[PDB]
Amino acid sequence: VISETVKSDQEIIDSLYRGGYAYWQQLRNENGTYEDKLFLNGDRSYVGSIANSGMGLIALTIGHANGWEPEAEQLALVTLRKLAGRDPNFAVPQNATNTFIHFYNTKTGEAVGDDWSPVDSAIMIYGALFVKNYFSENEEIAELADFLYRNTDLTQYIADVRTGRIYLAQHTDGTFKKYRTKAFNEYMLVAGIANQQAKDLDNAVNASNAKKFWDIWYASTKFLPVAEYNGIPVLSEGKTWFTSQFNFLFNNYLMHDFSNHPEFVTALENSAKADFAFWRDVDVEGVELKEYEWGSGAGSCPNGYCVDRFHFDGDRQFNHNLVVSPHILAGYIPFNDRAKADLISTYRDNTINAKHELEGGYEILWRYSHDQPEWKAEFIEGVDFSTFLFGLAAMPEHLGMDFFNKYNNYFELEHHHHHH
Ligand SMILES: [Cl-]
């Protein structure tokens, strides 16, 4: 255990906060694309993620605000021009409905995989709109953001209003894959854009249904499914399982419709209480978690890539390597009283492989396994890692959650809900 004499709580938080931004600085390519994964050894696969352009745009504002990225406005422009197809070296692939491919080659632009992804498209668009707000005097950033927002219609992904279903993905030719996904989850991101587009796009495919969908499932929490963890109500896709915790965090940091809505904020707080309670209920032979260890996330694991979820009464069947996620714990810091202290404790614990150093000596925390304590991650997926910086940045004495609730307000002016 690292003593408070060797390193103070403040020194730890300062290191991790700067480290969380250096991550993004390293994930970013000069051409304004972002790798899917950061390799801790300095390797680069040149496999990019569209989602990480959105998260990286957000991160640029955080670095800027902290004095760590004085070029940020121009880095944001480079990324947005690249996303808009305005760099002649290559464009990111889009399918027959202008949906972006999830992954692509960051040297050549070749598509990678089969996932023409509305959600990853939506994360990119949010990041564009976030930098538009942040660099609000740059007209070219506004124009590019508006172009990206208007040119992928997400109203088409609303599948069935009465059951809360959105199509997961499209095929190359623009038809939908079979799979539908139900509220509550991170497809709130999709719904939100579709709700705005219904108002804003002249030719929205499916405007009325997108509005109706939003009004039932996401204008309030009233109709969302609830699954109870030890009597704690947790929004979910149904009553007998839990969705991913990152869904609450992505929706909160990226969408005003979540972060500015007290029902949704309360839901995120409850969800974090359930994740803590879960980790305290785990009783696996040969494992002993300390009290400060918790957070159910997605990301690299001994099995490759894992989407870890909690389940009733400490049941770890949906957490295949019994991985604990410090990016999720960090993400909770503004929303749970003990998360910050627990993140620090986690850093101090030398029996777990949570600490990682980046090139340049920067420090972060990341996923580690209780089934395989000697495992140490070799890379970090940006979409998941996002919430580490965001949670640290949203500390009250850092930028605060009001930073995100201000700059994620894409669709309203400041006095919208005030007296005229
Ligand atoms: Cl991704």
Author numbering: 9 to 428
Kindly provide excerpts from the paper associated with this entry:
In this study, we used PgSGL1, PgSGL2 from Photobacterium gaetbulicola and EeSGL1 from Endozoicomonas elysicola as Group 1 proteins; SkSGL from Sanguibacter keddieii, a Gram‐positive bacterium, as a Group 2 protein; PgSGL3 and PgSGL4 from P. gaetbulicola as Groups 3 and 4 proteins, respectively. Groups 1 and 3 contained proteins from many marine bacteria, for example, isolated from marine sediment and mudflat environments. Because hydrolytic activities toward β‐1,2‐glucans were detected for PgSGL1, PgSGL2, PgSGL3, EeSGL1, SkSGLc, and XcSGL, the general properties of these enzymes were investigated using β‐1,2‐glucan alditols (see Section 4 for details) as substrates. While many of the enzymes showed optimal pH values around neutral pH, the optimal pH values of PgSGL3 and XcSGL were 8.5 and 5.0, respectively, which suggests that the optimal pH value varied within the SGL clan. PgSGL1 and PgSGL3, single‐domain enzymes, were eluted at the time corresponding to 42 kDa, while the elution time of SkSGLc corresponded to 140 kDa. These results indicated that PgSGL1 and PgSGL3 were monomeric enzymes and SkSGL was a dimeric enzyme. Interestingly, PgSGL3 (Group 3) produced Sop8 predominantly in the initial stage of the reaction, and then Sop8 was further hydrolyzed (left). When Sop8 was used as a substrate, Sop8 was hydrolyzed to Sop3–5 (right).
β‐1,2‐Glucans are natural glucose polymers produced by bacteria and play important physiological roles, including as symbiotic or pathogenic factors and in osmoregulation. Glycoside hydrolase (GH) families related to β‐1,2‐glucan metabolism (GH144, GH162, and GH189) have recently been created by identification of two β‐1,2‐glucanases and a β‐1,2‐glucanotransferase, respectively. Structural analysis of the proteins in Groups 1–4 revealed that they possess (α/α)6‐barrel folds similar to those of GH144, GH162, and GH189 enzymes. Overall, phylogenetic, biochemical, and structural analyses revealed that Groups 1–3 are new GH families, GH192, GH193, and GH194, respectively, and that the three families belong to clan GH‐S (clan GH, classification based on structural similarity) as GH144 and GH162.
